[PDB]
Every structure is written in structure tokens, then in C-alpha cells.
Scaffold this active site. Structure first.
Site, PDB file in Angstrom:
ATOM      1  CG  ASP A 464      -2.116   0.851   1.196  1.00  0.00           C
ATOM      2  OD1 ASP A 464      -2.392   1.518   0.187  1.00  0.00           O
ATOM      3  OD2 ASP A 464      -2.862   0.868   2.222  1.00  0.00           O
ATOM      4  CD  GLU A 467      -0.070   6.507  -2.867  1.00  0.00           C
ATOM      5  OE1 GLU A 467       0.205   6.688  -1.645  1.00  0.00           O
ATOM      6  OE2 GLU A 467      -0.818   5.566  -3.244  1.00  0.00           O
ATOM      7  CG  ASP A 529      -8.292   4.188   0.009  1.00  0.00           C
ATOM      8  OD1 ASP A 529      -8.114   2.956  -0.047  1.00  0.00           O
ATOM      9  OD2 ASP A 529      -7.598   4.955   0.722  1.00  0.00           O
ATOM     10  CG  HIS A 594     -11.712  -2.768  16.322  1.00  0.00           C
ATOM     11  ND1 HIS A 594     -11.673  -4.142  16.215  1.00  0.00           N
ATOM     12  CD2 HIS A 594     -10.636  -2.302  15.644  1.00  0.00           C
ATOM     13  CE1 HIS A 594     -10.610  -4.491  15.514  1.00  0.00           C
ATOM     14  NE2 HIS A 594      -9.970  -3.394  15.149  1.00  0.00           N
TER      15      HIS A 594
END
Ligand SMILES: OC[C@H]1O[C@H](OC[C@H]2O[C@H](O)[C@H](O)[C@@H](O)[C@@H]2O)[C@H](O)[C@@H](O)[C@@H]1O
Ligand SMILES: *[C@@H]1O[C@H](CO[C@H]2O[C@H](CO)[C@@H](O)[C@H](O)[C@H]2O)[C@@H](O)[C@H](O)[C@H]1O
Ligand SMILES: [Ca+2]
Ligand SMILES: [Ca+2]
Ligand SMILES: [Ca+2]
Ligand SMILES: [Ca+2]
Ligand SMILES: [Ca+2]
Ligand SMILES: [Ca+2]
Ligand SMILES: [Ca+2]
Ligand SMILES: [Ca+2]
Length: 729
Positions: A464, A467, A529, A594
Site C-alpha cells: 500500500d 505516493e 479507496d 472497532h
């Protein structure tokens, strides 16, 4: 203290308060001059010393523009009135020169602090540029579309900063490329650019991408194609017949030497053109068949118990998975060690498997046991990575030692003064960035992770980010400055982890969102995303087709979106069906602290939250379809490596002599034989597909249709329109 940086923070789409705008001043145009003060001040003046005259400007206090302030905090996806940040601690001041003289100068700033101190900055050069039609440099380009009198060179007494030139386009031509794009298939009529950037959600609305390329193919309605590739890793801009209706205007950033810009060109069939580009860029690698099953992912699966619960549920529900991605696996400090693992301190040296003891009551009591057992079930395991090394003051000793060892190795991206680059972005702010530009730097970084592959037996990495490098004057160990190295970064990043895997006897299964020219050779890609919306679904189809058209073969996306409340049942259904007929099929969910309710994109959680129990049966149905497609995906992919065609394939590759294909830009071929047409609107009970010439068989009913016509299909949730070419008996 007064801060002025002529180029500012160097966000590619935003200005900071401490810069020149434009950053490369142009004679005869306006020049805005910004500076900030560390403390509060009553006055700031800019003194500009011209050869014969001197002028003093009284600066005014300013705040960032609505657009600039937003972008520097990560954009509108990271912003709402509901969560209000503190005000800017910096105090911006500004003046402007409405028509910049074509004379070189120097300037400096002088502030008066509230307590009465005079502060004075260093001196800065002002060397205005102008556009010259003189043969200052040379465009190395063949073929017949280059307009030979078009080159203009942006020159100052310092040197040559940019060039622009034009290519001819004809009235029936369509332009597809520039890497993965989210807005539309045909880029004709648009102005865009190719710079690696992290646009958090709504990439299509903002016309930006994680995975640009300075390449496009140009296809006419007779079936002939040509293409071009500006052979550079510096930023490029494209006005694709928007301003002048038969010209592609190209602007190219140059170095920091006699400038020569190479433009590769090809002509022939659309396939000939893409192959030309692949010969220069690199070609997709062979991959193992298990990449084609369902990928399961969820950021909140952060314990061995949570992962295994979901794998057991897949099995009990009869919805097989081939891959599980675990993101929240590590200590969240160094991304090298499983959370709660115990070990002796290393001075930042690489660990081996036997260094670790895993507490029975910890989050991961036996990660090696998890992986072994998942392997026995035919499930491969992928772990998340980021090409950054946190430097928070509250990191534990191991993470601090790892960062000190990284710096001490030399293998870090550097600022122009030699000190380590500190990330200027909003995500992982001020983190170090490993230098992956040379073999030695790639090896240093990946050696820290080698035990994960060699001892724990993981099968790949979700690589991931990538950039994060902003700054034209950053320094890389390969000799490049940031203006070349920053777009290249994600290519080197994916390569580094691919090489680790290869060295350990495994396929180079990396899974990345960012890239550039050369990314075609290095693993798998997903579209990044997004929100769980119909518009994002449509944009994602565009992203896959356009990525395919630049040689990104193994592409997927977070089906139905990963961010926010779970997708509505109907969107999940349509997106799950569509994802079944794309190269990589994967569900995923964003971190949500969570909190309640659960935000997993599992079929069962979505069914629970939407009250739509039939979604589990639907996922069973489409996962059976996905399993039945495996031999087709494997064979067509092998064919794609030989032919150079995409797997998720725009219609123009096989049907460019039919002008009606351009009216249906979100249908596509999946390999040679299947025409796919995802249902992308809520409430649809029928759906229309354009069939090109030839005979076509309905995938679901066997019904035969004549090509060269529109056809309409009933679309219950158990149908996505799919037509198979009718072969010879
Ligand atoms: O753009 C950087 C980064 O943003 C997200 O992760 C951070 C965080 O962003 C918002 O606060 C959301 O509300 C949270 O749920 C997120 O955890 C993206 O998930 C990430 O992919 C992206 O790189
Ligand atoms: C890249 O980022 C997302 C993951 O980031 C989150 O999870 C990691 C690991 O637990 C945290 O270190 C980080 O702070 C979080 O933001 C992915 O879920 C997403 O798909 C991606 O584009
Ligand atoms: Ca606003
Ligand atoms: Ca917003
Ligand atoms: Ca005084
Ligand atoms: Ca000329
Ligand atoms: Ca440059
Ligand atoms: Ca040790
Ligand atoms: Ca702190
Ligand atoms: Ca949302």
C-alpha cells in the site's frame, strides 16, 4: 523566523502559504509571493532588488484558499464540519506583482514581531522565464502526427524548465490511456496530467489517479491506431483536443543540459500499439492460479481469532476463498513483527523466525500455525506493508532502533541538504521514506521482512502507499532528483517486494494501488479507496478498463466500496456480480476504530446490516460462477501474455472498426470470448447491451442473438449480462 520556500510544500495540486505562484515565475504574468512567520508579527515586507530599481511591497496577512487548505489536509474525503481541526499555527503573509518584469532580481523578507524584533530572511533569486520558439532543445519523435513548428521552450537565465509541443488528431479519433483513469474511457476533450498522487476517494470527480502513465493510444473508427509515450518519469500535462479541437498539446517538466525529449510512437492495430508500449515499459509476469479465487480482506481482522472466524465462516457458508489479506497484523510501529510477539532487542538488525515467542493470550498466539492451517485449506496469506518508517516520539525501542538503522544505512530518501526526507503528506506525517532506487536499498528494506516469507511462509504483500515523496530536489541513491524519482518510487517499491518473494522461492504476488510506467511487470493492482456508492462502482469499471489499456493486467477493486456504512443490499449484489467477471475479485473494509456496527464487507455482515438475507445465497451463487471461471481466467491470461492484450479489455481492441462501441464505454470483454455489461443503476429490471458483429450466446440461458444490434436482458440479482462468442461447431 520567516519561512519562504519558492516551490512550497510541493503538493502536486495545492499551494502552501510560503511559496511563489507560479513556482517558476513567467515574465509578463502575475507573480504571487508568500511567506510565513513562526511567531505573530505586525508587519511583513518583501524587498525586490531589480538591476536598476528597488521596490518594497507591504505584505498582507492571509489564510489559505478554501481549495488549498482542504487539499493540504488530504482533501474533501478527509474533511467535514463535524470534526473541526484547530486553526493553522503558521501566519501567512502575501503580496503580488501583476505583470512581472523580464529582468533578473533578488528578493528578501523583513518582519516586525509583536515584541518589536526585526527578522530578515535570506536572499532568494528571481529569474523570470519566457516561452521561446528558438531551437533550444530537440524533440526526438518519429511518425507523422508531430507538428514540427509546435515546440515552445520555457527558458530563463538559469536554464530550460519545461517544453510544450503538439500532435495532430483526426475527427473520428478517440484517446484511451494515461494509466488508470476514473472519469471516462475516452479522454478526448479533457485536460489532465500524469503525476503519482493519493486522491482519497472520488478519484473520478477530481480527475486524478494513483497510477498515471505518460502514454495513450489513439484509435480511429476504421480500426487503425497509433500511440505515443513521452519517455520520462517527470510530470507531464495533456490538453487532449480541449483548447484546439484537433491538437493534443503536451507539456513536459524538464531537469534541474541541452534538453532532449524522447517520444516513442507506434502505429498498426490497437494491439500493435499497446505491444509497442509494453516492449518499452515491461510486460506482466506469469502468476499462480490461486490469484483468481475470491480474496477476503477487512482492516478490523486484527487478531488470529478474528481472521480464523471469517475463514471458518467462508467454509461453513460454502463461499470459498483463495486469499486472505491481513492488514492489522503487526505491532503498528515497525510493520515487521506480529502484534504482542516477544523478542530480544536487535539494534535494528533483521530478525529470524526463532527470535519470537508468541504469548498464548496475545493477539497472534501462533502466526506460523495460522498460515500452515490456512495453507492446508487452500488459502494463501498476504500481509500489508507501507514504504514508510514512523518516527513518533511514543514509539517503543525496537521501532526507534529500526529507524536509526535505516538512517544509518544511508538507504533513505534525502532532502537537498542530505538530511532524511520527512513525509510531507497527511498520512504517516513526518515518517522516513526508504530509498528503494538501488538494489542495495531495496535489499536493506526487504531483508527486515525476509523471515515473514522464509520462516512464517506468507505468500505475498499488500504494498500500500508509495505516493509520499514530494519535492523536486529530493535526492535518491540512483542519482535521480525528486522530479524524476518521485513518480518512479512506486515502481521500485513493488519491485523490491517482488524480488524478495522471488528470492524466497515464491511468485511475486504484490498488491499495490500506486504506480507508473514499468508497473506492468510488478504484480497486481487494485483501484484504491472509495465510498460505497453507485458512482464509485461506475468509476471503478472505468479504472479497470483504462488500467488494462496501459498494460496493467491483474487489476481489481474493493467490490461495492470499502469506506463508510456497508453498501446497500442492491449495490452489494450488482457489484459482487460484476467483480466475478474482473481479473481480481476482492472484498475489503476500511478501519473504523472497532466501533459499532461492524463494517466488514463480508456477505454475512452486509446481509445482517441491510436485513437482506438473500445476499449470502447470492454470494454462494457468484462464487460458484467464479470457481467455474478459473480455467478460463488462467487460459485467457496466458494468451494475454503472448498477445499483449488486456484481460479486462476495452471493446476497441477486438472491434475498433465498429463506431457504435464508443457509445457503450462501461461494457468490456473479459478475455477473447465473454462480453460483460455490469448493471450500474439502482432499480434496474432490464439492461441493454450493444453486441458487435458475430453470433453471441447468453451465458445464463443459452439464448442466441445476432450481433451488430442492441439487446435487452431481464436482470434479476442472480443475472449480470454476459454474452459468449458463438464458436464454430
Ligand atoms: O488518505 C490517507 C489514508 O486515509 C485512510 O486511512 C486513515 C483514516 O482516514 C479517515 O480518518 C477515515 O475515517 C478512517 O476510517 C481511516 O482509517 C484510508 O483508509 C487509507 O487507505 C489512506 O491511505
Ligand atoms: C491503504 O491503507 C489502508 C490501511 O491503513 C490502515 O491500517 C494500517 C494497518 O493496520 C494502519 O497502520 C493505518 O494507520 C490505517 O490507516 C487500507 O485498508 C486501504 O485499502 C489502503 O488504500
Ligand atoms: Ca471547504
Ligand atoms: Ca467532505
Ligand atoms: Ca525597531
Ligand atoms: Ca521552433
Ligand atoms: Ca524539473
Ligand atoms: Ca536477535
Ligand atoms: Ca507525543
Ligand atoms: Ca461515504
Amino acid at each position: 523566523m520567516i519561512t519562504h520556500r519558492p516551490r512550497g510544500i510541493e503538493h502536486p495540486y495545492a499551494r502552501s502559504l510560503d511559496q511563489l505562484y507560479p513556482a517558476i515565475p513567467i515574465a509578463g504574468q502575475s507573480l504571487t509571493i508568500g511567506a510565513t512567520t513562526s511567531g505573530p508579527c505586525s508587519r511583513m515586507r518583501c524587498f525586490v532588488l531589480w538591476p536598476e530599481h528597488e521596490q518594497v511591497f507591504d505584505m498582507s496577512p492571509v489564510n489559505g484558499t478554501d481549495s488549498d487548505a482542504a487539499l493540504l489536509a488530504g482533501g474533501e474525503g478527509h474533511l467535514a464540519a463535524a470534526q473541526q481541526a484547530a486553526l493553522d499555527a503558521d501566519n501567512g503573509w502575501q503580496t503580488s506583482i501583476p505583470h512581472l518584469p523580464d529582468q533578473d532580481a533578488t528578493y528578501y523578507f523583513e518582519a516586525l514581531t509583536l515584541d518589536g524584533r526585526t527578522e530578515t530572511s535570506e536572499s532568494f533569486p528571481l529569474t523570470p522565464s519566457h516561452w521561446s520558439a528558438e531551437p533550444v532543445g530537440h524533440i526526438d519523435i518519429d511518425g507523422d502526427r508531430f507538428i514540427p513548428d509546435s515546440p515552445l521552450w520555457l527558458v530563463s537565465s538559469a536554464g530550460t524548465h519545461r517544453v510544450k509541443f503538439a500532435l495532430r488528431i483526426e475527427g473520428d479519433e478517440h484517446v484511451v490511456g494515461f494509466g488508470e483513469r476514473y472519469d471516462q474511457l475516452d479522454q478526448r476533450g479533457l485536460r489532465l496530467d500524469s503525476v503519482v498522487f493519493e486522491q482519497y476517494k472520488a478519484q473520478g470527480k477530481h480527475h486524478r489517479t494513483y497510477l498515471p502513465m505518460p502514454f495513450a493510444q489513439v484509435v480511429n473508427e476504421a480500426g487503425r491506431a497509433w500511440g505515443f509515450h513521452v519517455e520520462t518519469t517527470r510530470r507531464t500535462w495533456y490538453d487532449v483536443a480541449a483548447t484546439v479541437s484537433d491538437r493534443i498539446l503536451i507539456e513536459v517538466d524538464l531537469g534541474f543540459k541541452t534538453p532532449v525529449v524522447r517520444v516513442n510512437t507506434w502505429s498498426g492495430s490497437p494491439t500493435d500499439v499497446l505491444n509497442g508500449f509494453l516492449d518499452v515499459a515491461g510486460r506482466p509476469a506469469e502468476m499462480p492460479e490461486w490469484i483468481f479465487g475470491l480474496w477476503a480482506s477487512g482492516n478490523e481482522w486484527n487478531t488470529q481469532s478474528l481472521v480464523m472466524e471469517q475463514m471458518d465462516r467462508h467454509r461453513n457458508e460454502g463461499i470459498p476463498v483463495s486469499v486472505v489479506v491481513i492488514e492489522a497484523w503487526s505491532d503498528e510501529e515497525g510493520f515487521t513483527i506480529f502484534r504482542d510477539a516477544r523478542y530480544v532487542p536487535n539494534q535494528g538488525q533483521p530478525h529470524r523466525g526463532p527470535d519470537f515467542t508468541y504469548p498464548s493470550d496475545g493477539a497472534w498466539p501462533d502466526p506460523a500455525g495460522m498460515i500452515r492451517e490456512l495453507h492446508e485449506r487452500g488459502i494463501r496469506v498476504i500481509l500489508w506493508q507501507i514504504p514508510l518508517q514512523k518516527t513518533d516520539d511514543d514509539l517503543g525501542p525496537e521501532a526507534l532502533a529500526q529507524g536509526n538503522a535505516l538512517i544509518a544505512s544511508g538507504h533513505v530518501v534525502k532532502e537537498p541538504d542530505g538530511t532524511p526526507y520527512k513525509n510531507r503528506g497527511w498520512w504517516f506525517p513526518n515518517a522516513l521514506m526508504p530509498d528503494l532506487s538501488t538494489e542495495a536499498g531495496r535489499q536493506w528494506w526487504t531483508e527486515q521482512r525476509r523471515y515473514l516469507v522464509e520462516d512464517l511462509d506468507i505468500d505475498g504483500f499488500k504494498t500500500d502507499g508509495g505516493e509520499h515523496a514530494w519535492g523536486s530536489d529530493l535526492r535518491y541513491e540512483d542519482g535521480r532528483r525528486g522530479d524524476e524519482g518521485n513518480n518512479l518510487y512506486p515502481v521500485n517499491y513493488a519491485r523490491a517486494y517482488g524480488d524478495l518473494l522471488r528470492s524466497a522461492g515464491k511468485y511475486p504476488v504484490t498488491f499495490s494501488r500506486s504506480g507508473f510506467t514499468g508497473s506492468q511487470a510488478h504484480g497486481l493492482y487494485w483501484a484504491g479507496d472509495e465510498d460505497s456508492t453507485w458512482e464509485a462502482f461506475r468509476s471503478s469499471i472505468t479504472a479497470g478498463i483504462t488500467a488494462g489499456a496501459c498494460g496493467i493486467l491483474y487489476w481489481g477493486w474493493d467490490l461495492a466500496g470499502f469506506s463508510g456504512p456497508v453498501p446497500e443490499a442492491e449495490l452489494y449484489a450488482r457489484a459482487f456480480a460484476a467483480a466475478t467477471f474482473m481479473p481480481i475479485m476482492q472484498y475489503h473494509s476500511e478501519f473504523h476504530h472497532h466501533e459499532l456496527p461492524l463494517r466488514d464487507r463480508t456477505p454475512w455482515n452486509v446481509a445482517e446490516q441491510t436485513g437482506c438475507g438473500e445476499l449470502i445465497d447470492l454470494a454462494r451463487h457468484y462464487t460458484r460462477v467464479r470457481e467455474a471461471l478459473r480455467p478460463y481466467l488462467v487460459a485467457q491470461t496466458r494468451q494475454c501474455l503472448q498477445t499483449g492484450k488486456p484481460l479486462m479489455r476495452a471493446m476497441f481492441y477486438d472491434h475498433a472498426d465498429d463506431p457504435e462501441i464508443w457509445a457503450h464505454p462501461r461494457q468490456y470483454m473479459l478475455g477473447d470470448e465473454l462480453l460483460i455489461n455490469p448493471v450500474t443503476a439502482p432499480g434496474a429490471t432490464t439492461w441493454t447491451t450493444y453486441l458487435p458483429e458475430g453470433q453471441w450466446e447468453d451465458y445464463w440461458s443459452g439464448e442466441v442473438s445476432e450481433g451488430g444490434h442492441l439487446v435487452t436482458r431481464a436482470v434479476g440479482w442472480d443475472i449480470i449480462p454476459v454474452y459468449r462468442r458463438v464458436g464454430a461447431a
